[PDB]
């Protein structure tokens, strides 16, 4: 149904709103019937979920019918279809967690090849496209490559990932040096 995107090692808020603006009974679980967290009595409980530590909600917003799921330090394999269950509601949200790295270590050289790689989760259709500090645009799949680097490229690169109609945007600093051999 609803589809949220998120960056690696980042934070995201999955929303789940039921009617009767009040602290009623609820819980979150993933696609594999594993309780992420829920309210037992009035107190927040955390389940056997792999996310046990990095998962939390927001208590004050419970009296407003809101029951948000909050996940910090997002890893990629956290990508999944999360299910919130309230009263007789089944509100589903698919989280997809992308990441972006420069597989060329760092400190590159005029003429060398640069490659940005998109760490995507299993079973995704990402369409990336970036923008150098000049204006030129490159686009591709998991692998976007710059054949041969310039000095004008030394700066901050912006990159747009598009999943479905939603999108996330990374920025990644790259430095380029010059060299000669006489």
């Amino acid at each position: 149904k609803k589809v949220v995107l998120g960056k690696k090692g980042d934070t995201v808020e999955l929303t789940c709103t039921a009617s009767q603006k009040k602290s009623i009974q609820f819980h979150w679980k993933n696609s594999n019937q594993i309780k992420i967290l829920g309210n037992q009595g009035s107190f927040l409980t955390k389940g056997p979920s792999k996310l046990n530590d990095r998962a939390d909600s927001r208590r004050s917003l419970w009296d407003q019918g809101n029951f948000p799921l909050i996940i910090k330090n997002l890893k990629i394999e956290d990508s999944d279809t999360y299910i919130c269950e309230v009263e007789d509601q089944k509100e589903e949200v698919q989280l997809l967690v992308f990441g972006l790295t420069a597989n060329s270590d760092t400190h590159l050289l005029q003429g060398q090849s640069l490659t940005l790689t998109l760490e995507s989760p299993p079973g995704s259709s990402p369409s990336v496209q970036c923008r150098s500090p000049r204006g030129k645009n490159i686009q591709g799949g998991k692998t976007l490559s710059v054949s041969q680097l310039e000095l004008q490229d030394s700066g901050t690169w912006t990159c747009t990932v598009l999943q479905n109609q939603k999108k996330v945007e990374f920025k990644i600093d790259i430095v380029v040096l010059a060299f000669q051999k006489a």
Partner: antibody
Amino acid sequence: QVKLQQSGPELKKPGETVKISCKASGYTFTDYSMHWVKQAPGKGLKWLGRINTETGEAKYVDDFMGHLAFSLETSASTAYLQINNLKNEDTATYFCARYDGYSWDAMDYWGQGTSVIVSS
Amino acid sequence: DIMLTQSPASLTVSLGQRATMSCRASQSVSTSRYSYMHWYQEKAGQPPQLLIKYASNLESGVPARFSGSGSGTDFTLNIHPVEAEDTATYYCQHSWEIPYTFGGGTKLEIKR
């Protein structure tokens, strides 16, 4: 106190099919994934596959296509494991078991253990 | 891929002595708070039975002489003092990521 009840032991020739059943009585069948484990004679345990008792979806690690087909009958709280192209390797003891997704128990309840014997 | 390697493959110990069995995971199966590991006991021709759940918690009934410990990639059970009925094969299982694989097992025998 729940409990998992499987089918009796089975004798099949090589190349035949066998369908062993597992029924849960004590909890709500569709609120817990069901896992299957194989233990060949004289060997140790080995995980086989989990089936989602809500969606029907199951993931398993069997060599060769087919041969391992997990299915459900929610209408009678019963999970099935079907082995299609039997072999002398398949001769083993098979267990189904629940995995507590709600609480900090684990494979908390197992099955009696079905004994498939494949030989001519 | 998550491989569990148990050592030793077999253990021989006299009554009243301490039995130590290790289980090493290829990758971490824990998250600060908890560790997703389990120990089973399977006596001669018996079904396996859960002994320790989540690395350090004794199952109901299990005698106090059993204990589990460890975190991350290294885990240990202890049986002290060993008794006659402890003759059995012991396995270890992780519930980190499907497949919930098993260790190779360790057979414990008593020296009289």
